[PDB]
């Protein structure tokens, strides 16, 4: 079991918020991006990385990673329900809300707990790993496979040149 | 086909959704634009009607083809999400983008007149769906491309024959 294995599951836990999110804002008829709101959420991690003794801009990067590759699961179901609007699947965001919350938190406490493996030669296999085993046990399709790699992508730090 | 130079003409439509999409991404602009789909569907209705051309089936064929191309850009968008790197840094200002679509609304219109006679046949599902083959072939389509060519195409066999 990867080290990052934790990590990874609760990103793409994260990421299956996408659903129920684009579910309810295509009812709504809202859009998926809103720029303001993404720099609010990305403030917020900041502050909570430096409550928490974690490296704030790193928290940020991973953040922005994560949130970019959620709404690209928002825009691919958009697309679907462009083609084939009785398809598309209600409720409220509340649980949604809760949800990444909690995902938040258990995010930031693998990034401190494995803050050496990220900054360390074997972070990209352990990532590797890790994706291998989420993918499977999660059962992620493409799209998800896709998004999980994209959320992932600046885990491992970069190693000294020399 | 007797139907392929339209279907041909609704796939190069389709294709202008790339160039749009690149530059609503650079520009943060929304995909869907309802004035515009409104301006077309107006301008396309009156025509219909002055070429003496069933208006309401004409609304019904546009209205398919538009949201394919929205389905389209949303996809790029997602695509572009995941990596940004792929979205083309220097397209076609959407103003030109538009013009070709102006074009293209025309020539499409132009084919639904010049082809009534078959879309209005019970021959018109094969015809269409024969054509539909090839253009996918000549264009080389993908799979995106060939959900919303199916789209794009899905109310053609509606026409009523003439009285
Ligand atoms: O902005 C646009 O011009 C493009 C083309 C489009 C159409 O299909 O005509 C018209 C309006 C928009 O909602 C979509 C679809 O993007």
Redesign the interface.
């Known amino acids: 079991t990867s080290q990052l294995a934790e990590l990874v599951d609760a990103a793409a836990e994260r990421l299956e918020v996408a659903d129920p999110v684009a579910a309810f804002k295509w009812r709504a008829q809202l859009?998926?991006e809103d720029?303001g709101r993404v720099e609010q959420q990305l403030a917020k991690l900041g502050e909570d990385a430096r409550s928490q003794h974690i490296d704030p801009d790193y928290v940020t990067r991973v953040f922005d990673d994560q949130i970019?590759?959620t709404?690209?699961?928002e825009?691919?179901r958009?697309?679907?329900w462009?083609?084939?609007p009785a398809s598309a699947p209600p409720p409220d965001l509340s649980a949604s809300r809760s949800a990444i919350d909690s995902l938040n938190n258990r995010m930031l406490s693998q990034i401190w707990s494995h803050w050496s493996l990220l900054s360390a030669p074997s972070c990209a296999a352990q990532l590797d790993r890790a994706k291998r085993d989420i993918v499977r046990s999660r059962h992620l399709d493409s799209l998800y496979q896709?998004?999980l790699?994209?959320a992932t992508q600046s885990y491992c730090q970069a190693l000294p040149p020399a």
């Open positions: 859009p998926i720029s970019r590759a709404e690209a699961i825009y691919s958009f697309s679907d462009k083609l084939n896709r998004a790699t994209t």
